[PDB]
Design an enzyme around this catalytic site. Structure first.
Site, PDB file in Angstrom:
ATOM      1  N   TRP A  27       0.687  -1.248  -0.043  1.00  0.00           N
ATOM      2  CA  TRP A  27      -0.017   0.087  -0.112  1.00  0.00           C
ATOM      3  C   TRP A  27       0.941   1.402  -0.050  1.00  0.00           C
ATOM      4  O   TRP A  27       1.812   1.431   0.999  1.00  0.00           O
ATOM      5  CB  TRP A  27      -1.000   0.011   1.326  1.00  0.00           C
ATOM      6  CG  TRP A  27      -1.896   0.956   1.362  1.00  0.00           C
ATOM      7  CD1 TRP A  27      -2.863   1.172   0.138  1.00  0.00           C
ATOM      8  CD2 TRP A  27      -2.278   2.056   2.424  1.00  0.00           C
ATOM      9  NE1 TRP A  27      -3.421   2.083   0.584  1.00  0.00           N
ATOM     10  CE2 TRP A  27      -3.215   2.739   1.891  1.00  0.00           C
ATOM     11  CE3 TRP A  27      -1.671   2.182   3.744  1.00  0.00           C
ATOM     12  CZ2 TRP A  27      -3.656   3.612   2.475  1.00  0.00           C
ATOM     13  CZ3 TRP A  27      -2.279   2.995   4.194  1.00  0.00           C
ATOM     14  CH2 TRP A  27      -3.373   3.864   3.830  1.00  0.00           C
ATOM     15  N   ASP A  73      -1.427  -4.211   9.934  1.00  0.00           N
ATOM     16  CA  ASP A  73      -2.514  -3.181   9.199  1.00  0.00           C
ATOM     17  C   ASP A  73      -3.592  -4.136   9.104  1.00  0.00           C
ATOM     18  O   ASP A  73      -3.564  -4.799   8.352  1.00  0.00           O
ATOM     19  CB  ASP A  73      -1.732  -2.645   7.845  1.00  0.00           C
ATOM     20  CG  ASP A  73      -2.694  -1.629   7.331  1.00  0.00           C
ATOM     21  OD1 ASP A  73      -3.858  -1.546   7.817  1.00  0.00           O
ATOM     22  OD2 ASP A  73      -2.501  -0.936   6.563  1.00  0.00           O
ATOM     23  N   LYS A  80     -13.853   0.572   6.122  1.00  0.00           N
ATOM     24  CA  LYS A  80     -14.347  -0.124   5.263  1.00  0.00           C
ATOM     25  C   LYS A  80     -15.477  -1.092   5.689  1.00  0.00           C
ATOM     26  O   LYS A  80     -16.597  -1.149   4.932  1.00  0.00           O
ATOM     27  CB  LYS A  80     -13.196  -0.900   4.232  1.00  0.00           C
ATOM     28  CG  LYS A  80     -12.365  -0.010   3.113  1.00  0.00           C
ATOM     29  CD  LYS A  80     -10.912   0.296   3.834  1.00  0.00           C
ATOM     30  CE  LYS A  80     -10.117   1.325   3.053  1.00  0.00           C
ATOM     31  NZ  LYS A  80      -8.492   1.180   3.364  1.00  0.00           N
TER      32      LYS A  80
HETATM   33  C1  LIG Z   1      -7.590   1.995   3.781  1.00  0.00           C
HETATM   34  C2  LIG Z   1      -6.372   1.489   4.176  1.00  0.00           C
HETATM   35  C3  LIG Z   1      -5.871   1.734   5.588  1.00  0.00           C
HETATM   36  C4  LIG Z   1      -6.791   2.810   6.557  1.00  0.00           C
HETATM   37  O1  LIG Z   1      -7.470   3.745   5.752  1.00  0.00           O
HETATM   38  P1  LIG Z   1      -8.389   4.737   6.818  1.00  0.00           P
HETATM   39  O2  LIG Z   1      -9.346   5.087   5.974  1.00  0.00           O
HETATM   40  O3  LIG Z   1      -7.309   5.703   7.246  1.00  0.00           O
HETATM   41  O4  LIG Z   1      -8.774   3.721   7.838  1.00  0.00           O
HETATM   42  C5  LIG Z   1      -4.928   1.135   6.246  1.00  0.00           C
HETATM   43  N1  LIG Z   1      -4.169   0.160   5.413  1.00  0.00           N
HETATM   44  C6  LIG Z   1      -4.406  -0.150   4.069  1.00  0.00           C
HETATM   45  C7  LIG Z   1      -3.697  -1.275   3.420  1.00  0.00           C
HETATM   46  C8  LIG Z   1      -5.759   0.309   3.578  1.00  0.00           C
HETATM   47  O5  LIG Z   1      -5.887   0.052   2.118  1.00  0.00           O
HETATM   48  O1  LIG Z   2      -7.141   1.987  -2.444  1.00  0.00           O
HETATM   49  C1  LIG Z   2      -7.089   2.030  -0.898  1.00  0.00           C
HETATM   50  O2  LIG Z   2      -6.254   1.495  -0.703  1.00  0.00           O
HETATM   51  C2  LIG Z   2      -8.131   2.252  -0.350  1.00  0.00           C
HETATM   52  C3  LIG Z   2      -8.597   3.577  -0.607  1.00  0.00           C
HETATM   53  C4  LIG Z   2      -7.468   4.634  -0.460  1.00  0.00           C
HETATM   54  C5  LIG Z   2      -6.889   5.541  -1.553  1.00  0.00           C
HETATM   55  N1  LIG Z   2      -5.830   6.190  -0.883  1.00  0.00           N
HETATM   56  C6  LIG Z   2      -5.906   6.075   0.457  1.00  0.00           C
HETATM   57  C7  LIG Z   2      -5.533   6.612   1.561  1.00  0.00           C
HETATM   58  C8  LIG Z   2      -5.788   6.220   2.682  1.00  0.00           C
HETATM   59  C9  LIG Z   2      -6.981   5.375   3.054  1.00  0.00           C
HETATM   60  C10 LIG Z   2      -7.376   4.872   2.006  1.00  0.00           C
HETATM   61  C11 LIG Z   2      -7.139   5.161   0.847  1.00  0.00           C
END
Ligand SMILES: *Cc1c(COP(=O)(O)O)cnc(C)c1O
Ligand SMILES: O=C(O)CCc1c[nH]c2ccccc12
Ligand SMILES: *Cc1c(COP(=O)(O)O)cnc(C)c1O
Lengths: 396, 396
Positions: free
Chosen positions: B130, B211, B246
Site C-alpha cells: 500500500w 495493518d 471499510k
Molecule cells: C484503507 C487502508 C488503511 C486505512 O484507511 P483509513 O481510511 O485511514 O482507515 C490502512 N491500510 C490499508 C492497506 C488500507 O488500504
Molecule cells: O485504495 C485503497 O487502498 C483504499 C482507498 C484509498 C486510497 N488512498 C487512500 C488513503 C488512505 C486510506 C484509503 C485510501
C-alpha cells in the site's frame, strides 16, 4: 522492545481532568480545562449544532472520503470569518485552507509543513503560553524559544519587554501569536500594538503563525479578527491555525483549520501541495461530522443567526461571571484587589495564585485550577460562586 | 518563505480521484480507490450506521473532549473483535487500544511512537504494498525496507521469497503484515503460513505490526483474525493498526484504532503513556462521531445483528462481482486466463494489466484503475460489467 519504556509525565492540563474525574468528593469544582459551562453547570451541545446534525442525519447519503483538505465550503467560510467580506486574500486567491482535526491538528500540520518544506528552525512563543505549543513544535523537530509578554506585577501586556525579546528573533523565524483571548493570560494587544507588531515583523523577516482558538469570545467575531487582519494587510505570507472547538462547542468532533497565505496563487498552490502531502502522511483526510456541522451552520442564514446568538450568549455569560467573581471575592474579604480580572478576555483569568495556593485549593477544597494559577471563568456559576470564593479567600 | 517550495507529486491513489472528478466523459468507470459500491453504483451509508446516528442525535448531551485514547467502550469492542471474546490478552490486561483518526492515523501514531521510544530503525513492508505505507514511516524518520511477497507469474504468495528476504531483517526490526485482504494483491497467507511466520518472528526478534483494514471482507469477522490471533499467541509484544472505514462504510469519519500489546500490564501501561504522548503532540484527541457510531453498534445486540448482515452482504456481493468479472472477461474475448482472480480476497484484484494498458483504459475508454493494474472489484456492477470487460478486451 517495550521493556524500557519510561512512563511519560503528565499533561499539566489534560492530566488534571483525570484527577478531577477520580475524586469522590461531593462539591468539587472544575476550573481547569477550558470548557464553556452553563448556568446549570453543564457542557451542552449548542442548539444550532443539534439542528445541523438532524439535517445531516436526514440528508447525508454517503460517507465517502473527503479530500485531503476537507470540505470546500468549510474552507470558504473559514477564510471569510478569518479575513472578511472583501478581503483581497480571497479575491486574489491567495489563501488555501485545510480542514484539520482541531486547532491542535492544524498546528501539527503547519509544524510538519514548516520543518519539511522550509528552512525554519525555531518558533517563538509567548511566555507564558499554552503548554501544548512546545510539544507540538518539538515533535516536528522545531526549536521553541520564548518571548516575554506578561507584566505579572501589573497584570498587563509588557510591550517593550515583548519587543525587546523578539529582536533576538532572526528573519525566517516563526513568530506565534494568539489571535485573541491570550491563553493563559487573557491580555491581548490593542489594535495599535497589533499594528506595530505587524510593521515590525515585516521588517524583521518573521513568519507569523496565528493560533486563533477563541474567535468571538473577546469582543466579537469581526473584532477579534483585527490583529490577524492587520497582519494580513502587510504580509505576503502567514499561517493560521484556527479552532472551532470553543465557539461552536464542538470539542470532541475535532474541528479546526490550517490556513496558508502566500504572496500569490501560483505560490500558495505550490506550498499548499506540500501541506497536503504532510497531511497524507498523517491522518490522511479529516473527520467530516464536526466540519459538516460547521459549514452547514455558516452557510445557512437562519442557523447562522441562531449560532451567533448562542455565541454572544456564551461570551456575555462569561463577562458576567467575571464581574461576579471579583465582587464575590471582595465581598468575602479578599486581601488582594482582583479587578484586573475584568480587563482580561475570554474563558480564563490569570489569578495570580501561587503553585502552593492552587495545590491547597485542590487537596483541601476540591477547587481545580491549573498550577499556573489559571482559573477557567466559564466554569463558574452563581451557584458555585460562593464556595469557590471562599476557598480562594482561605488560601490567600 | 514559500518562494522555492516545489509542488509535491500527487497521491498515486488520491490523485486519480481528482482526475476522475474532473473527467466529463459520460460513462466513466471508477475502479481506483477502494470504496465499496452497491448494485446501483452508489457509496451508501449503512442502515445500522443511520440508526446509530439517530440514537446519538437524540441522546448526546455534550461534545466534551474525549480522552487522548478516546471512547473506552470502543477500545473494549475493538479488542474483542481483534483478539476474540475471552482472550488471555484481555484477561491479562495486556492490550491498550487508542482510538485514532482512521487506520491511517493509527499507523502514524505507531510510527511516531516507535521512532521516539524504541530504537526501531527500520520497517519492512511487503512488495507490492500500500503506497501510503512508505510515507507514514518515512515521515517518522523510519526506514522502509521491502520483502518479497507476490509471484507475478503464478499469481500467488511466494512463501520462499517471502521467507528468504526476511532473513535480512535484523532483530528488533519492525515487520508489517496485512491482517487480511492483502492490499493490493488479494493474497493472504493460509493459517499455516501464518503459524510459521509467527514462529519465525519470535525466533528472529521482529516486532510485528498489523495493518488490519478489511476485517470481515475475506471470510468473516473471526476468520479474518486467525493470523493476528496466531501471532498474539506467541508474541509478547505487538502493534495493531485497524480501520473501521471499510467494514462500517465510515470512510470520512476517520475511525480506526492502534492497539499496543506487551508482555504485561505494567509494561503495556508504561508504554502506552508514551503512545498517548505522541497523540497529544499530534491531534490531541480523536473525533467522537464515527467511533461513537462504532461503539453503539458493536455494543447493541440488535444493531450489531443488522450490521453483520450488511457487512456479510457487502462481502458476498464482492465475491459475486468476482466470479462475474472472470466470466464476463472470458465470455467476451480475453486472451489471458483470469481465473486466479477468484482466489483473491477483499475489494481488489491484481489484474496483471500493465502500466500502459491502464493508461489506455483511462485515456481511451474511461476506466480508472491504479497503475499497479489493481482494480477495485467493489466498484464493479452488473450494469457496468459489460462495458468494463469490453474495454478490457480492447487492450489485451
Ligand atoms: C484503507 C487502508 C488503511 C486505512 O484507511 P483509513 O481510511 O485511514 O482507515 C490502512 N491500510 C490499508 C492497506 C488500507 O488500504
Ligand atoms: O485504495 C485503497 O487502498 C483504499 C482507498 C484509498 C486510497 N488512498 C487512500 C488513503 C488512505 C486510506 C484509503 C485510501
Ligand atoms: C484550545 C486551544 C487550541 C486548539 O484546541 P482544539 O481543541 O485542538 O481546537 C489551540 N490553542 C489554544 C491557545 C487553545 O486554547
Amino acid at each position: 522492545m517495550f521493556e524500557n519504556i519510561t512512563a511519560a509525565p503528565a499533561d499539566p492540563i489534560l492530566g488534571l481532568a483525570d484527577l478531577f474525574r477520580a475524586d469522590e468528593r461531593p462539591g468539587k469544582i472544575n476550573l481547569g480545562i477550558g470548557l464553556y459551562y452553563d448556568e446549570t453547570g453543564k457542557i451542552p451541545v449548542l442548539t444550532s449544532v443539534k439542528k445541523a446534525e438532524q439535517y445531516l442525519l436526514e440528508n447525508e447519503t454517503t460517507k465517502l472520503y473527503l479530500g485531503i483538505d476537507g470540505i470546500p465550503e468549510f474552507g470558504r467560510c473559514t477564510q471569510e470569518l478569518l479575513f472578511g467580506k472583501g478581503s483581497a486574500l480571497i479575491n486574489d486567491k491567495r489563501a488555501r485552507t485545510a480542514q484539520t482535526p482541531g486547532g491542535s491538528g492544524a498546528l501539527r500540520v503547519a509544524a510538519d509543513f514548516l520543518a519539511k518544506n522550509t528552512s525554519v528552525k525555531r518558533v517563538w512563543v509567548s511566555n507564558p503560553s499554552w503548554p501544548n505549543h512546545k510539544s507540538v513544535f518539538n515533535s516536528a523537530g522545531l526549536e521553541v524559544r520564548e518571548y516575554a509578554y506578561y507584566d505579572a506585577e501589573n497584570h498587563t501586556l509588557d510591550f517593550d519587554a515583548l519587543i525587546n525579546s523578539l529582536n533576538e528573533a532572526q528573519a525566517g523565524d516563526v513568530v506565534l501569536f494568539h489571535g485573541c483571548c491570550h491563553n493563559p493570560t487573557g491580555i491581548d494587544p490593542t489594535l495599535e500594538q497589533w499594528q506595530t507588531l505587524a510593521q515590525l515583523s515585516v521588517e524583521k523577516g518573521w513568519l507569523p503563525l496565528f493560533d486563533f482558538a477563541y474567535q468571538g469570545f473577546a469582543r466579537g467575531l469581526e473584532e477579534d479578527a483585527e490583529g490577524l487582519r492587520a497582519f494580513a494587510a502587510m504580509h505576503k505570507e502567514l499561517i493560521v491555525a484556527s479552532s472551532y472547538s470553543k465557539n461552536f462547542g464542538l470539542y470532541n468532533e475535532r474541528v479546526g483549520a490550517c490556513t496558508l497565505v502566500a504572496a500569490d496563487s501560483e505560490t500558495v498552490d505550490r506550498a499548499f501541495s506540500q501541506m497536503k502531502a504532510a497531511i497524507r502522511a498523517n491522518y490522511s483526510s479529516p473527520p467530516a461530522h464536526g466540519a459538516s456541522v460547521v459549514a452547514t451552520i455558516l452557510s445557512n442564514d437562519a442557523l447562522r443567526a441562531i449560532w451567533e446568538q448562542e455565541l454572544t450568549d456564551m461570551r456575555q455569560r462569561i463577562q458576567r461571571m467575571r464581574q461576579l467573581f471579583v465582587n464575590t471575592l471582595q465581598e468575602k474579604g479578599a486581601n488582594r484587589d482582583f479587578s484586573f480580572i475584568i480587563k482580561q478576555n475570554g474563558m480564563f483569568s490569570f489569578s495570580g495564585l501561587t503553585k502552593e495556593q492552587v495545590l491547597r485549593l485542590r487537596e483541601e477544597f476540591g477547587v481545580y485550577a491549573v498550577a499556573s494559577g489559571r482559573v477557567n471563568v466559564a466554569g463558574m456559576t452563581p451557584d458555585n460562586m460562593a464556595p469557590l470564593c471562599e476557598a480562594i479567600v482561605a488560601v490567600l
